[PDB]
């Protein structure tokens, strides 16, 4: 019964009636001295009637798998890095120092791009200067700053070639008949593209350009193309080093926007597709690694005033591939409209239908879509409107559900006139009409 | 505190004692059948004799009321006063009243139980003494006049606070009021203890399980946008899911299946919690509708599982338990259904557990992954552990024809996994 | 160096430093004696008022202090001081040079464990006097019997025995005959705390991995085990008012409450104290009461109370979580700036490196209050950043 006996309590002999506390554990009025084991049992029963015996001691001593795992765990969700893809409906986004806070901008920030490799952010606006900022968390400083006189800029892009990844050009352009190209060398050697090689009537302003990669497809030689959106339906594609007009692609209607998709073919060969949208909603896809010939023509379901198309989930022009084997096919395609409606198509199945239905039509912000950008992993789309204040949403996808905890009513987004995603850090830059790039870090990355 | 507060406390203690005629009239006019002017003039003998008639009717319907005729409805209980015996006799007759109430909770659609519990209302004052068990037992019947009647005569507990605008009202409480009632945490602990006594004494009936599961999944739906409320709420509803899975009723088992599937799709639970949940699901699986719900539940609970480790081989104990509850024909047939459930990550984990733990049933994994389509990472992990199977054991025709399937679709991927580990000419020389 | 203008008076603003405090009970009231460096301070547990401060500073830091009815036993560098109302009544010099670092008091015996694993027993002279005063014997826990002594307790109804909790073992000595009655089996991880349960002959052991053992000191077995993964256990306390709850205290600053009857987990108070200053260092239920006093190394002493249950019939299954009650505190970091608030020398403003501005009272330590940092509204009506 017991695991020890000490053989001293049996031969001890206590008094009882000397103190008032032990005066109660007698069983007679003639008891004065009792044996030790008797005395131990008397005050054991007295302890049991001071503190009554609970049921957990004598009840039990030590299909129940769920009960056991709940009684051991204290947190009940995935911990830190065994997630690898974003949780919906609640972001995790801290605010860093405003990127152009070191050197203020004298205009609305019209375009904004990160570097493909270096920690550099290029801002530029209608005050005809363009600024590069070394960004980090604390102290986003200004690397360099170039003021092109008489040339307000509207689109500015870091281009970095695929062959040697050592060029680092900046192409910039506004409402002018020329487009500048700064060659980054850390004086500054910039060149000016001002010759459409016979095609000046169909290109009266170099505002809306995009830079992309193109393969020769008889050699494995890539070169950058700039793509200019012109008047009638025209996209004029021209070489990014020589400026020679390579080809042109005409859509039927009012050309409003376009984007560049890539798809790999074999080891070291890919194919460039230009995706251009009418104002009405009908979309042309041109294969342009051959002559600029149409391969697909489909129609956006709904959508009547179409302002902005974007692809994402692979290599876009804003998440660019540094190495030719890292070129990916884009999964998602968002067509954002004048009413604020953004149709979202999933190109893993919506390349075949020719009247494809969107996987969801987002309707959360109600005025004209002027930016929509995909995060480099292709899990967030960023809708943004330069028409009212604070009109920016980050929609999670594949779930196609807007994050409900950011932005709040106190986010200093401003009148969002540009947006950019970092290719590596998981990091938003949001430029507003006051001239401020605000900077946020998504803690999933 | 104040004197009027301390006197409100002594009034709430002495609520049931009739200290004069006016309090006796106001306290005895609280009936469940009659109105106040008839109920105040009735006797104990009259209401006892027709309650004993109704208990004989209720007992010939369901024969577990005969012992209540022995003790709670006997003729010594006409003269038994409640507030004259001590706390130990009070707890004896209050668990007698709790036994009667959770036995007769199912019978509340037929008038003998109304005329029988009329005598518990008027002799033992269970509308004001044993009132929490009365509300919890008849909570299902909230669109019905019998719950309207007990709300009119009840004195409402502090946990049931949101029903206080539906007492002495002509309209029933609504479903959104029921979800607001269930949305509390202390009410959730109270209701789960009530269900624990129900599951223990084997009185869970299907209308109760439907109502309970509906309110539970609406609580989870309401709290689906605050993770701290979901995290307060997890060891309550997963504990009641474990205690519903640990019983014999197919209805309460698939009630727990519903709670588990809604809760796992509401928040991403831990991998080990999901595995222990499927162990508790399989450890008492005896019915057929329970088997249907159990396969769908295990598929969705593995679907809602993210990160590094979603599609491992599920371990040897749980895989052979899942084998003993669901053999090959069941899994293959359920995948051959034209409604197309989403069984991606679970079927991947299943085939990887077959390749680590069976090593004989590989023709069936060829047939089932011929049936359903998987993703690139799924089939990449499948062909990597088939490559490891080829390198551990000698490569016969079933592994060869598996690699013929993985050559006939997506041969570039099996080339990519062989080039990540091995070589194609060396593997063709192997097999 | 001694001075001739200014003489030392007190060191204000100190409540605890993370020595495990002692509770004591005069009649039906409770006092809480906490160590502040080299003095202790007695607090009235019903209102956390400073009753007493020890009269002289000890020559080194107080390292283990206990409290029976009127007397407080404070062990510092070598010796044990027996104090009543602050004023020291006796001083027990040990015969070693080892630092005394644990003690228990039961019967006529005071037992003080040093850090060379020797135990010094002291005896009363005649059982009517007030404190144990004369040397009796010496006990030794050698490396065969057990590890370093990690606690020293006397669980009740054990006639002149002593439960010695070593890092791996539990020994049981008879302190009159100097004998080792019973040595338990080993424990697979190092045990850090011990607390005697109000259940008869049961002690509760807390390990450096996360488990609470409920050792039955007469059967030699363990009754049950409670697992709290990746948490070092620094306190154990038991509720003794007809509700069988246990409260464990975790060195990441957490206070976890368990029901032992129905084996569930009642509630967790997270970040009850700072982990960087030691976590919850001593948590104890005032017995018979639903209030538990915690104290941490961040110069803070709190009380938490259990309200009565909100369900009028169930009760035992609907346990309302513990809420906060009174607390005293000071700076958790050394102060960086000092000013006097008024000409009367009553309040003094004091700012510290832990980024708090306190207002400390030189007249009555209950009046010390942290100046709040809750901002006003903006004057125009715009948003504040």
């Amino acid at each position: 019964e017991a695991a020890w006996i000490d053989s001293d309590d049996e031969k001890i002999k206590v008094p009882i009636l000397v103190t008032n506390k032990t005066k109660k554990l007698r069983t007679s009025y003639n008891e004065s001295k009792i044996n030790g084991v008797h005395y131990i049992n008397r005050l054991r029963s007295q302890f049991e009637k001071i503190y009554p015996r609970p049921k957990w001691v004598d009840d039990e001593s030590d299909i129940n798998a769920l009960t056991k795992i709940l009684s051991t765990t204290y947190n009940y969700k995935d911990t830190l890095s065994n997630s690898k893809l974003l949780p919906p409906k609640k972001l995790d986004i801290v605010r860093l120092k405003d990127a152009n806070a070191s050197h203020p901008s004298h205009s609305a920030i019209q375009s904004l791009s990160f570097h493909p490799s270096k920690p550099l952010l290029l801002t530029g606006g209608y005050d005809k200067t363009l600024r590069i900022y070394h960004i980090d968390g604390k102290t986003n400083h200004l690397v360099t700053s170039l003021h092109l006189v008489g040339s307000p800029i509207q689109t500015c892009t870091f281009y970095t070639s695929l062959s040697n990844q050592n060029q680092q050009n900046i192409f910039t352009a506004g409402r002018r008949r020329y487009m500048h190209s700064w060659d980054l060398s850390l004086t500054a050697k910039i060149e000016k593209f001002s010759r459409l090689y016979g095609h000046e009537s169909t290109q009266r302003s170099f505002e809306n350009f995009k830079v992309a990669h193109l393969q020769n497809s008889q050699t494995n030689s890539v070169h950058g193309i700039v793509l200019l959106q012109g008047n009638n339906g025209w996209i004029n594609i021209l070489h990014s080093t020589s400026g020679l007009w390579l080809m042109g692609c005409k859509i039927e209607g009012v050309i409003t926007d376009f984007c560049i998709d890539y798809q790999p073919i074999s080891r070291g060969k890919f194919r460039t597709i230009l995706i251009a949208v009418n104002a009405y909603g009908e979309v042309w896809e041109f294969d342009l690694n051959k002559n600029g010939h149409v391969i697909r023509r489909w129609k956006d379901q709904g959508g009547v005033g179409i302002t902005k198309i974007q692809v994402g989930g692979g290599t876009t022009t804003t998440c660019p591939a540094l190495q030719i084997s890292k070129i990916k096919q884009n999964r998602w395609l968002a067509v954002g409209s004048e009413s604020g409606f953004v149709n979202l198509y999933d190109r893993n199945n919506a390349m075949t239908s020719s009247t494809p239905t969107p996987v969801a039509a987002l309707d959360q912000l109600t005025t004209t879509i002027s930016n929509l950008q995909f995060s480099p992993d292709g899990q967030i789309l960023c809708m943004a409107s330069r028409a009212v204040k604070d009109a920016l949403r980050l929609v999670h996808l594949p779930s196609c559900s807007v994050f409900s905890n950011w932005p709040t009513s106190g986010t200093p987004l401003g009148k969002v006139t540009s947006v950019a995603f970092s290719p590596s850090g998981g990091l938003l830059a949001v430029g507003n009409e006051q001239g401020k790039v605000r900077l946020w870090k998504l803690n999933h990355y | 505190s104040s004197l009027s507060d301390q006197l409100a406390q002594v009034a709430s203690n002495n609520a049931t004692v009739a200290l004069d005629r006016k309090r006796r009239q106001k306290l005895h006019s609280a009936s469940l059948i009659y109105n106040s002017k008839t109920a105040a003039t009735q006797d104990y003998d009259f209401i006892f004799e027709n309650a004993s008639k109704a208990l004989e009717e209720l007992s010939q319907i369901e024969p577990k009321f005969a012992i209540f005729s022995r003790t709670l409805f006997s003729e010594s209980s006409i003269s038994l006063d409640r507030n004259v015996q001590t706390k130990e006799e009070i707890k004896d007759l209050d668990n007698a009243i709790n036994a009667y109430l959770l036995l007769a909770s199912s019978k509340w659609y037929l008038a003998p139980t109304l005329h029988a519990t009329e005598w518990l209302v008027r002799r033992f004052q269970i509308h004001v003494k044993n009132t929490e068990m009365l509300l919890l037992s008849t909570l299902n019947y909230y669109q019905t006049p019998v719950f309207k009647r007990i709300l009119s005569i009840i004195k409402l507990p502090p946990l049931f606070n949101c029903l206080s605008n539906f007492v002495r009202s002509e309209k029933p409480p609504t479903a959104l009021t029921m979800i607001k009632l269930f949305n509390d945490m202390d009410f959730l602990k109270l209701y789960t203890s009530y269900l624990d006594q129900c599951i223990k004494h084997n009185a869970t009936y299907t209308n109760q399980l439907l109502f309970t599961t509906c309110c539970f999944i609406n609580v989870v739906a309401f709290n689906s946008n605050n993770d701290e409320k979901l995290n307060q709420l997890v060891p309550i509803l997963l504990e009641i899911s474990a205690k519903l899975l640990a019983s014999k009723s197919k209805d309460c088992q698939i009630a727990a299946h519903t709670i588990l599937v809604v809760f796992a799709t509401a928040l991403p639970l831990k991998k080990t919690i999901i595995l222990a949940a499927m162990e508790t699901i399989l450890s008492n699986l005896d019915a057929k509708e329970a088997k249907h719900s159990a396969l769908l539940t295990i598929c969705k609970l593995f679907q809602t599982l993210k990160g590094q480790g979603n599609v491992d081989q599920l371990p040897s104990k749980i895989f052979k338990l899942f084998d003993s509850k669901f053999d090959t024909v069941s899994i293959l047939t359920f995948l051959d259904k034209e409604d197309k459930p989403v069984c991606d990550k679970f079927i991947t984990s299943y085939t990887r557990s077959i390749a680590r733990y069976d090593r004989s049933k590989l023709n069936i994994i060829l047939s089932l992954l011929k049936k359903i389509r998987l993703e690139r990472y799924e089939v990449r992990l499948i062909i990597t552990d088939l490559i490891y199977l080829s390198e551990i054991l000698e490569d016969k025709s079933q592994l060869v024809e598996l690699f013929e399937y993985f050559i006939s679709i997506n041969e570039d991927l099996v080339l990519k996994c062989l080039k990540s580990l091995g070589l194609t000419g060396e593997l063709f020389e192997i097999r | 160096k001694n001075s001739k203008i200014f003489s030392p008076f007190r060191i204000i603003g100190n409540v605890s430093n993370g020595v495990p405090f002692a509770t004591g009970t005069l009649g039906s009231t409770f006092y809480i004696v906490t160590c502040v460096g080299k003095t202790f301070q007695i607090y009235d547990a019903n209102t956390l008022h400073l009753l007493f401060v020890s009269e002289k500073e000890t020559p080194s830091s107080i390292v283990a202090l206990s409290a029976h009815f009127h007397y407080v036993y404070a062990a510092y560098e070598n010796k044990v001081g027996i104090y009543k109302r602050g004023i020291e009544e006796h001083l027990l010099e040990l015969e070693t040079d080892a630092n005394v670092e644990h003690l228990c008091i039961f019967g006529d015996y005071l037992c003080a464990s040093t850090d060379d694993n020797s135990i010094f027993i002291y005896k009363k002279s005649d059982p009517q006097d007030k404190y144990p005063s004369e040397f009796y014997t010496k006990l030794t826990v050698t490396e065969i019997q057990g590890g370093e002594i990690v606690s020293l307790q006397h669980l009740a109804t054990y006639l002149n025995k002593l439960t010695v909790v070593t890092k791996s073992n539990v020994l049981l000595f008879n302190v009159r005959t100097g004998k080792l009655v019973f040595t338990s089996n080993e424990f697979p991880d190092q045990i850090t705390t011990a607390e005697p349960a109000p259940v008869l002959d049961i002690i509760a052991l807390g390990t450096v991995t996360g488990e609470v053992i409920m050792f039955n000191m007469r059967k030699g077995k363990r009754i049950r085990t409670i697992k709290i993964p990746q948490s070092r256990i620094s306190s154990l306390s038991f509720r003794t008012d007809g509700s069988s709850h246990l409260s464990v205290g975790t060195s990441s600053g957490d206070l976890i409450f368990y029901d032992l009857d129905r084996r569930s987990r009642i509630h967790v108070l997270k970040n009850i104290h700072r982990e960087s200053y030691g976590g919850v260092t001593q948590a104890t239920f005032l017995n018979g009461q639903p209030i538990i006093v915690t104290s941490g190394g961040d110069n803070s002493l709190k009380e938490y109370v259990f309200d009565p249950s909100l369900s009028q019939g169930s009760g035992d299954v609907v346990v309302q979580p513990p809420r906060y009650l009174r607390s005293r505190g000071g700076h958790s970091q050394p102060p960086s700036y000092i000013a006097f608030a008024d000409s009367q020398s009553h309040f003094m403003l004091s700012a510290s490196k832990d980024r708090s501005l306190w207002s400390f009272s030189l007249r009555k330590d209950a009046q010390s209050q942290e100046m709040s940092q809750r901002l006003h509204k903006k004057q125009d009506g715009g948003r504040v950043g």
Binding site: - | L159 | G107, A156, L159, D241, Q289
Partner: peptide, 28 residues
């Protein structure tokens, strides 16, 4: 109306405690 999480005013009570001074015996 939601349930009323209000706190009561807490007063301590009179508790009995075992004191261990009776747990020590002398030999003749």
């Amino acid at each position: 109306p939601k349930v009323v999480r209000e706190a009561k005013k807490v007063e301590m009570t009179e508790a009995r405690a075992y004191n261990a001074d009776a747990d020590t015996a002398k030999a003749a």
